[PDB]
């Protein structure tokens, strides 16, 4: 009822996601329309039932005229529900989720998959990332600010964490990473520092 094809048949995928976000938040009991939008972005880059946003609202406005594509759609909805519940359980914040989706899991890193598949590896990576964000401290806002960019330098990270710059450098040369390209490298360096 609320949205018909008239304005849903636009071409901007991001605008369609923005339009559908409040409805997704209402149907998933989510926190904010932007977090609903970002969950939609995850589910669209994942394609559980192989459905994009355009096909999504077209088949929604269609009155369940599908045999197995309705099953695909409910799988899509269950996937977005799983992502929202994981976000709620990890207490991942608005800015953290926004930065992660904007980076498209490139600054997060992945194993054998583009972006990231919804499984235990990415779950543990996100949990450790959220713990790191919680332990960041007061400069954590600016830390995430240049983490959005690629200007987060090793000495700046050393100053923020309060450890030794030589410790950070030997962590670099031990993990073999010359730059914090992804959170995979970041967590490798962090675990090396932890075991030291």
């Amino acid at each position: 009822p609320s949205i018909s094809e008239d304005m849903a048949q636009s071409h901007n995928r991001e605008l369609q996601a923005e339009i559908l976000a409040p409805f997704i938040a209402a149907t998933l009991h989510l926190a904010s329309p932007d977090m609903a939008r970002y969950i939609l972005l995850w589910t669209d880059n994942l394609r559980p039932g192989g459905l994009d946003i355009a096909g999504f609202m077209t088949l929604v406005l269609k009155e369940s005229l599908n045999a197995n594509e309705t099953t695909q759609l409910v799988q899509f909805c269950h996937v977005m529900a799983q992502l929202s519940l994981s976000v709620q359980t990890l207490r991942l914040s608005e800015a953290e989720l926004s930065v992660l989706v904007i980076s498209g899991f490139a600054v997060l890193g992945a194993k054998n998959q583009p972006a990231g598949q919804h499984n235990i590896d990415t779950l543990f990576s996100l949990y450790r990332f959220h713990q790191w964000i919680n332990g960041l401290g007061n400069p954590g806002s600016d830390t995430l600010d240049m983490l959005r960019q690629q200007t987060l330098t090793a000495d700046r990270l050393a100053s923020v964490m309060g450890l030794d710059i030589s410790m950070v450098t030997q962590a670099m040369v031990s993990a073999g990473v010359n730059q914090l390209q992804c959170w995979q490298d970041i967590n490798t360096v962090l675990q090396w520092i932890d075991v030291a």
């Binding site: 409040p22 904010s32 329309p33 932007d34 608005e94």
Partner: protein, 49 residues
Amino acid sequence: YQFFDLTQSFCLMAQEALRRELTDNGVTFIRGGAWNGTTAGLMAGETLL
């Protein structure tokens, strides 16, 4: 959200009507920012007022 979009269209067309009535095309006071998306787009009412 829908009601705010309608009210923003109404205020923009009112601004254009005032521009026509005053025969000027440089005055602008509705400059966006009413929908602060970081906070569900609130505090548009006093700005539009």
